[PDB]
Design a protein around this nucleic acid. Structure first.
Ligand SMILES: [Cl-]
Ligand SMILES: [Cl-]
Ligand SMILES: [Cl-]
Ligand SMILES: [Cl-]
Ligand SMILES: [Mn+2]
Ligand SMILES: [Mn+2]
Ligand SMILES: [Mn+2]
Ligand SMILES: [Mn+2]
Ligand SMILES: [Mn+2]
Ligand SMILES: [Mn+2]
Ligand SMILES: [Mn+2]
Ligand SMILES: [Mn+2]
Ligand SMILES: [Mn+2]
Ligand SMILES: [Mn+2]
Ligand SMILES: [Mn+2]
Ligand SMILES: [Mn+2]
Ligand SMILES: [Mn+2]
Lengths: 105, 90, 96, 77, 92, 108, 99, 86
DNA sequence: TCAATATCCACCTGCAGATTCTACCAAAAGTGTATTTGGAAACTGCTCCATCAAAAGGCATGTTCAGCTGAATTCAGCTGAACATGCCTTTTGATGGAGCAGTTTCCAAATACACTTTTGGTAGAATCTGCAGGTGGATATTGAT
DNA sequence: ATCAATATCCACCTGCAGATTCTACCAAAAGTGTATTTGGAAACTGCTCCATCAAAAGGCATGTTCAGCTGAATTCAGCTGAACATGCCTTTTGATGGAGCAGTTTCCAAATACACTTTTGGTAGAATCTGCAGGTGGATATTGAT
């Protein structure tokens, strides 16, 4: 017995991704490599975000990542920020940022 | 109802073995994964249609990734995809 | 007896609320407003609590971002005080 | 009911938006804006709700409406 | 190498609304662009609608809902009238 | 096998129901497509086309012109609030812009 | 008689009316063509172009710049100025979510 | 057999051309620093569209950028363009 | 620079409660075969594309110079911030029940395809025609008298 | 309370490049007939939400005081617009040659199709441990008087 994800060296479900592609009304047919590739990409992005968010969680002396940590992680990363420029993260709040002119002296 | 929760958790344990995640944050990760899935699959679908191809392959996925992802994220994601396909194929 | 100068407490509040993530509008009035507006589109509607919550997160995120842009407009006009004029400029440039 | 969105709430929102000083005329203005926003989302949301032949607006209806306004929301799926 | 387009139908409509008016080739190109655009918007939204509700069939109801989501106000109401009337007549 | 009658003729439309149906079928939108869907869609597309051509024709006559050009389409769309909303993110090639000078810029 | 001379602004206003009335492309064709081919050459070499492709690029670019200048103008006027400055462009593009 | 190297063509977008564009945009008065600024902005814009366009061209295994490639790039950048689908 | 305050910020501990762990079981995924088929390779017919050429005039560039704009400054009216009081709205916690979602079964009705004809849509060819420019005279507007 | 000095409209005119109509073949609808799905109408049921009641806490509305910000008024020095001469280079039209799209045929590597059996992920309580609710005290900042 072997899963496709095991073979591809992935954690994300290749079979599921493949099935979602087939039933997603995207194309009449779906190639064997497409769900492997897609699953790999999704896993990679997830890994990057969890990496940074985990860093923020450790910085806040917490063992559990919360939405705030995800917001901090995403917005303080230029490319992740562009990728998610039109996305609202519930309970994420905003980056602390005060316009210099508003400060005293 | 299905979700990516267990896979997100596995990845989390890979990159931070002693770190957990709140329920809300997991919900946000699920939203994220579904969102990017739709962006990439949608773009790949359009790519296939424009070129009168009835099959979405890893090549459409790759091109779609290059269109949707910025800079370094695109390069690394492309690397991971190709690498995974190569390993799976082996 | 003590008195912080105008601006100090404002700034302190900015740091406080930018540090946190809690919803800033009271639940019940928002609920009331949402159900009221919704009645004008379709009648005898009900709402999941999560639906109302989604609406509130979205609304507050939107308003906060708008206030950021508004602030930028005011500062652009060499002011520290946001005015309806600033909001209107921001919304016009947004294509709202 | 629009008056239920009080002055200090709007001040809190502005503070989160980094605003240091606020004109008195802002609040009513803000309310108008808020109203419009809600009217736009809820409308679409309810549309989805009625397409599903339901009477209960779900979180997903809202999410789809926001998504279609390009106001994508994470966390309510 | 035959190419299809909405040109003749756009022209028929034009002759309906302005019997003594013509149209440049470029303006016709813009009209074709328009029709294809709105087609993709409506069909796409209807596809999503069908998927959200676990339905395998796009019907006139999906099309109608999509029209209501995509078009503003009176444009939407009028479009809905045209669509509904066309379907009711067609079935009969 | 009777005398053929087109779906567009039955629906009372100018726009091609059959073509629209085919495009729905091969556009990968859904596994199945109802009979009324392409009729409805064709009707809507036709209607929108009619509204825009109406306004653009009016604009063309306002310029003492008998042929609609892209400029007329722009005038029609931008001077109409709802069409402007519908096409808010659309560029009309060779359309130019609406004449509009900010009052403060005028001589004082 | 000193020769004729319009006051600063009059000819500017005249030009505004003129170009808002017309629809012709305002950038010279050949130099735009060169710019496009140069930039494209930096992504992929020995590319060719349909003439309509370049035309599409120019229509899009000019519509974009014109709209940008509208917003920029509003930003300048907001600050009680009549003269658009780089600050105005930067504000407009920031609020647009371009930066 | 091959054309002269394309160099510094962004300067081909002259001061009076930019002035004309601004006029259509309703601008009455223009700071001297605007033109260079504009050149930067346009440059970025083009880079973003053309990039995607070329991507489409490369996906189709073509060596010729078509109007449709451009149209698709503009569309995915939320810059929908009418009039070149023909 | 300074006493005299007020407010953050880190750190602490007791536990309520979110999160992680477990184990059951439909429902997906996997699997073993068996058949099809999309599209890539491989000519190849011809569009368009790239580049150059001449010439003519439209437009870019540099120059001069002064009007008027933007920037810098001054000042005080009155607006908006901060703070103290006390009322009431919202928050929080229950209870009851009906009004929606969500589900199964089963056939009538709706759709899917393939086969077989027909006809509306297309590509040039043959015709038709605005309108682009070209000319010129009234009307409007502008800046200095 | 006007004249010059320009720019802008407004009508008229006609040839031709662009639009429209005409022709006739044929791709793609339409008609027809079987094969498959599916829409819901009837009939149940656990639950979500709504309606109503209730206490109480903290958040808001209000009144007072005043600091300081916004807007008006003023002043000036350069910058940016207007105008003009030069001559470059864009535009226009066409030639020349071929790179590179498309069109057609051919045939397998890759994908779909079934019939069943494993494997897995969703679910809801148990078990496990982490934030958090407040409280302390030390760091950090602020304020007004010098
Ligand atoms: Cl593949
Ligand atoms: Cl105002
Ligand atoms: Cl239907
Ligand atoms: Cl500047
Ligand atoms: Mn280069
Ligand atoms: Mn066979
Ligand atoms: Mn084949
Ligand atoms: Mn000034
Ligand atoms: Mn004072
Ligand atoms: Mn016929
Ligand atoms: Mn003319
Ligand atoms: Mn045939
Ligand atoms: Mn079989
Ligand atoms: Mn088996
Ligand atoms: Mn398992
Ligand atoms: Mn702890
Ligand atoms: Mn605490």
């Amino acid at each position: 017995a072997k899963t496709r994800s095991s073979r591809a060296g992935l954690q994300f479900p290749v079979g599921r991704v493949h099935r979602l592609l087939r039933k997603g009304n995207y194309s009449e047919r779906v190639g064997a490599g497409a769900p492997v590739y897609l699953a790999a990409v999704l896993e990679y992005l997830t890994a990057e975000i969890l990496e940074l968010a985990g860093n923020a969680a450790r910085d806040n002396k917490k063992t559990r990542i919360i939405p705030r940590h995800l917001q901090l992680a995403i917005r303080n990363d230029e490319e992740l920020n562009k990728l998610l420029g039109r996305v609202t993260i519930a309970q994420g709040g905003v980056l602390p940022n005060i316009q210099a002119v508003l400060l005293p002296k | 109802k299905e979700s990516y929760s267990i896979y997100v958790y596995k990845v989390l344990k890979q990159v931070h073995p002693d770190t957990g995640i709140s329920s809300k944050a997991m919900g946000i990760m699920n939203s994220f994964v579904n969102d990017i899935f739709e962006r990439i699959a949608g773009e790949a679908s359009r790519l296939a249609h424009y070129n009168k191809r009835s099959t979405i392959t890893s090549r459409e996925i790759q091109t779609a990734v290059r269109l949707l992802l910025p800079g370094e994220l695109a390069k690394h994601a492309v690397s991971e995809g190709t690498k995974a396909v190569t390993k799976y194929t082996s | 007896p003590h008195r912080y100068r105008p601006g100090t407490v404002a700034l302190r509040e900015i740091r406080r609320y930018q540090k946190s993530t809690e919803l800033l509008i009271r639940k019940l009035p928002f609920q009331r407003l949402v159900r009221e507006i919704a009645q004008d589109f379709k009648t005898d509607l009900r709402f999941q609590s999560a639906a109302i919550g989604a609406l509130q997160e979205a609304s507050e995120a939107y308003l906060v971002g708008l206030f950021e842009d508004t602030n930028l407009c005011a500062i652009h006009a060499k002011r520290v005080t946001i005015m309806p004029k600033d909001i209107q400029l921001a919304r016009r440039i947004r294509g709202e | 009911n629009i008056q239920g969105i009080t002055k200090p709430a709007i001040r809190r929102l502005a503070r989160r938006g980094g605003v240091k000083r606020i004109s008195g005329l802002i609040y009513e203005e803000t309310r108008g804006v808020l109203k419009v926003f809600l009217e736009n989302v809820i409308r679409d949301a309810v549309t989805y709700t009625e397409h599903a032949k339901r009477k209960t607006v779900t979180a997903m209806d809202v999410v789809y409406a926001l998504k279609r306004q390009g106001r994508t929301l994470y966390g309510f799926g």
